[PDB]
PDB file of C-alpha atoms in Angstrom:
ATOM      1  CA  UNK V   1       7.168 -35.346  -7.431  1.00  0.00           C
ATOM      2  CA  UNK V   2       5.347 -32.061  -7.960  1.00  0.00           C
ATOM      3  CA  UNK V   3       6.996 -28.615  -7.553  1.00  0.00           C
ATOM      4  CA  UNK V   4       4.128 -26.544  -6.187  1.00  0.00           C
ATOM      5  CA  UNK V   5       4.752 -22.510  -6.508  1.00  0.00           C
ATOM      6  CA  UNK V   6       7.060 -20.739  -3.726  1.00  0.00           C
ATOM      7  CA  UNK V   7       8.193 -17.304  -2.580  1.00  0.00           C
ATOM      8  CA  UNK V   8       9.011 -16.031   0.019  1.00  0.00           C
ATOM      9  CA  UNK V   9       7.537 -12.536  -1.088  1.00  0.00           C
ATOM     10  CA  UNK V  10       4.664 -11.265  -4.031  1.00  0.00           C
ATOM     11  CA  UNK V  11       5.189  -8.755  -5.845  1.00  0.00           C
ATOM     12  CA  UNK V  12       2.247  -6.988  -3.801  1.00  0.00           C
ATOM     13  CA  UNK V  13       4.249  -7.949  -0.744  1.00  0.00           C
ATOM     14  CA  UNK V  14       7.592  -6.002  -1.868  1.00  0.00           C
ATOM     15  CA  UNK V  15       4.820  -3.015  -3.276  1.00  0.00           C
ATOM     16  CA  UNK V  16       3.291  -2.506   0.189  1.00  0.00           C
ATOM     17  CA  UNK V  17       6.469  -2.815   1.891  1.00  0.00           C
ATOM     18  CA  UNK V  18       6.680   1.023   1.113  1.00  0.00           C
ATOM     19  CA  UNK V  19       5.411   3.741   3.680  1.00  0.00           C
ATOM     20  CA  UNK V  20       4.525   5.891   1.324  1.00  0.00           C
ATOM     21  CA  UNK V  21       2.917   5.402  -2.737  1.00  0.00           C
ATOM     22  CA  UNK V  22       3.225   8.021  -4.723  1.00  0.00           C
ATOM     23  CA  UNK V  23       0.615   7.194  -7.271  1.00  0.00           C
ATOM     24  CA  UNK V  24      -2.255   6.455  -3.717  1.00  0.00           C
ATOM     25  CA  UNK V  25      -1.462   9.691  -2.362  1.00  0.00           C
ATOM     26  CA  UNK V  26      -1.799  11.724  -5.598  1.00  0.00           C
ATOM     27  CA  UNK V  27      -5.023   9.858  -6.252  1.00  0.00           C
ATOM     28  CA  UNK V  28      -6.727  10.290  -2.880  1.00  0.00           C
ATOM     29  CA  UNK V  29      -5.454  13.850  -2.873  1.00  0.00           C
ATOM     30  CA  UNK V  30      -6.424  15.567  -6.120  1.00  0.00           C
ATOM     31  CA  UNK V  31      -9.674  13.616  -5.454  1.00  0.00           C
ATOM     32  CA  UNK V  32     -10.079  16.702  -2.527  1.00  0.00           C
ATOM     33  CA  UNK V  33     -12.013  18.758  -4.681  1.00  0.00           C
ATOM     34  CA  UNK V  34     -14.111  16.038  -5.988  1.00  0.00           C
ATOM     35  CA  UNK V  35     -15.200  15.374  -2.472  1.00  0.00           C
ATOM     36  CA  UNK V  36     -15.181  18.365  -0.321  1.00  0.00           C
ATOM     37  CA  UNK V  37     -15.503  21.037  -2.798  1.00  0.00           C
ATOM     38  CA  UNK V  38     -17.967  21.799  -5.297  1.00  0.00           C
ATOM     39  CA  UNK V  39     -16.767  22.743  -9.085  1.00  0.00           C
ATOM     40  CA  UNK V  40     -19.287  23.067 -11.452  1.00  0.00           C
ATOM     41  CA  UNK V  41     -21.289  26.063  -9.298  1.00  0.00           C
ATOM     42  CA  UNK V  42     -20.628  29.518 -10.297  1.00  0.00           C
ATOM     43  CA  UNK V  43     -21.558  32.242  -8.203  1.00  0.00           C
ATOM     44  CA  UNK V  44     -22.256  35.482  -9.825  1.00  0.00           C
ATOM     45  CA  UNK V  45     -23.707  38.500  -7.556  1.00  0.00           C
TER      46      UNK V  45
ATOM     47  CA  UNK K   1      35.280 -61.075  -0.947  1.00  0.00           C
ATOM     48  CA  UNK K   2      33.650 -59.275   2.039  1.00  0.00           C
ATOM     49  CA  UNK K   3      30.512 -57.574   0.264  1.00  0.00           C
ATOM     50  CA  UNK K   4      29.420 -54.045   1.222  1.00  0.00           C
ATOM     51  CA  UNK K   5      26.400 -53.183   3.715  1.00  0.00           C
ATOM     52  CA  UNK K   6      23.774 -50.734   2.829  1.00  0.00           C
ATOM     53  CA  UNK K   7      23.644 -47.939   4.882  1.00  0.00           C
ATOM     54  CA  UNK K   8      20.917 -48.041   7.890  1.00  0.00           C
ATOM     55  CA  UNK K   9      19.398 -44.680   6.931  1.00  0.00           C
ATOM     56  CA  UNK K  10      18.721 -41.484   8.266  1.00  0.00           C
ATOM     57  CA  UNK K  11      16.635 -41.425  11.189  1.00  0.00           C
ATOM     58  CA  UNK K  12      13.915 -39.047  10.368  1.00  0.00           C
ATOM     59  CA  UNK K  13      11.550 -37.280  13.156  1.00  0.00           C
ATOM     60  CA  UNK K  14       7.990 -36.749  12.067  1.00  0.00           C
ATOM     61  CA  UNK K  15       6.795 -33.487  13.465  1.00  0.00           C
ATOM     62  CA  UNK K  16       4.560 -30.434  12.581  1.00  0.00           C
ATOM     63  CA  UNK K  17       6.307 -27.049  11.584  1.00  0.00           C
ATOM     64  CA  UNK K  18       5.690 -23.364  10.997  1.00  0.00           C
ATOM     65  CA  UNK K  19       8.206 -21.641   9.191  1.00  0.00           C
ATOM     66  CA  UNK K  20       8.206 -17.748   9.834  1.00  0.00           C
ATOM     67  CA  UNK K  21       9.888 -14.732   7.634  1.00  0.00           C
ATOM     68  CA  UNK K  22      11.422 -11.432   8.405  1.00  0.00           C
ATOM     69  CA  UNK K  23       8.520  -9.150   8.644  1.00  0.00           C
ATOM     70  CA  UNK K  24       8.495  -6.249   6.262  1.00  0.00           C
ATOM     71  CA  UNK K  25       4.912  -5.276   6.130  1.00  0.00           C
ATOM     72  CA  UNK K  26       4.319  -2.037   8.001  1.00  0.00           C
ATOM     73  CA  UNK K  27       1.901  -1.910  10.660  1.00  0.00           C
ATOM     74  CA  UNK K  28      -1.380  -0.230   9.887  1.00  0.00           C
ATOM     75  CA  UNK K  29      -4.165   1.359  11.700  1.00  0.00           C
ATOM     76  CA  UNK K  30      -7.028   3.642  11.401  1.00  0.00           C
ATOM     77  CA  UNK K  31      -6.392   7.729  12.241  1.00  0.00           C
ATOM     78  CA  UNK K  32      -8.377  10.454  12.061  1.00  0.00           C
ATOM     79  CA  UNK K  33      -7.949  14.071  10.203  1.00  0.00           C
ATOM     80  CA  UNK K  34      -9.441  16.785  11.968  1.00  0.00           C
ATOM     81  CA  UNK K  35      -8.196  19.931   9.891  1.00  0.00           C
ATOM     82  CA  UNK K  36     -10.171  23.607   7.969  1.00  0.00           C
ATOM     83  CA  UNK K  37      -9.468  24.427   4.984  1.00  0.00           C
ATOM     84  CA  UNK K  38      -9.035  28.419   5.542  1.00  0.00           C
ATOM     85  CA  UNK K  39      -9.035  30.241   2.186  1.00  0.00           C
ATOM     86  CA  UNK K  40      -8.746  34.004   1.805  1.00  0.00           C
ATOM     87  CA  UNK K  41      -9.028  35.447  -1.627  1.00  0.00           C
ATOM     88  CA  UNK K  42      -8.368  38.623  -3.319  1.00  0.00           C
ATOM     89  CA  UNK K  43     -10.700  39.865  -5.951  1.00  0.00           C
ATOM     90  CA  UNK K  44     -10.227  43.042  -8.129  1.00  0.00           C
ATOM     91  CA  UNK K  45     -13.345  43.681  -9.528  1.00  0.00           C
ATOM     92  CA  UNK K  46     -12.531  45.259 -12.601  1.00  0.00           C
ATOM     93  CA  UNK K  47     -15.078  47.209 -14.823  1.00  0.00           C
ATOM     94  CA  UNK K  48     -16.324  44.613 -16.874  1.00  0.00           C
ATOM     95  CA  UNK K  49     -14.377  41.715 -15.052  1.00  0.00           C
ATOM     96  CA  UNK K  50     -13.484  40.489 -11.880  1.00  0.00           C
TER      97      UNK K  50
END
């Protein structure tokens, strides 16, 4: 007999279970000025 | 002596199955953010700075 690999849950199962990430939120929001913003121009009048 | 039987057997029933599990993924859909970013700043401008 062969004993093929079961669970009931992965590990990415139990890891999306969440609402809320902490590490995907702070990554898609300190990405803000990345996107909508631009740094690197200086404006001097 | 009078010699044992062997059992008959447990009648099995061949069928097709789906097993199902407590749900525990959350339901997901697409939104979206309509917001403005509204910043007011204060500059001093100094005499060689600002």
């Amino acid at each position: 007999h062969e004993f093929v690999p079961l669970e009931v849950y992965t590990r990415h199962e139990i890891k999306d279970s969440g609402l809320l990430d902490y590490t995907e939120v702070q990554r898609r929001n300190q990405l803000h000025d990345l996107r909508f913003a631009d740094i690197d121009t200086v404006i001097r009048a | 002596r009078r010699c044992p039987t062997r059992p008959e057997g447990q009648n099995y029933t061949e069928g097709i199955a789906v097993v199902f599990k407590e749900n525990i993924a959350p339901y997901k859909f697409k939104a979206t953010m309509y917001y403005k970013d509204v910043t007011v700043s204060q500059v001093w401008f100094g005499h060689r700075y600002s």
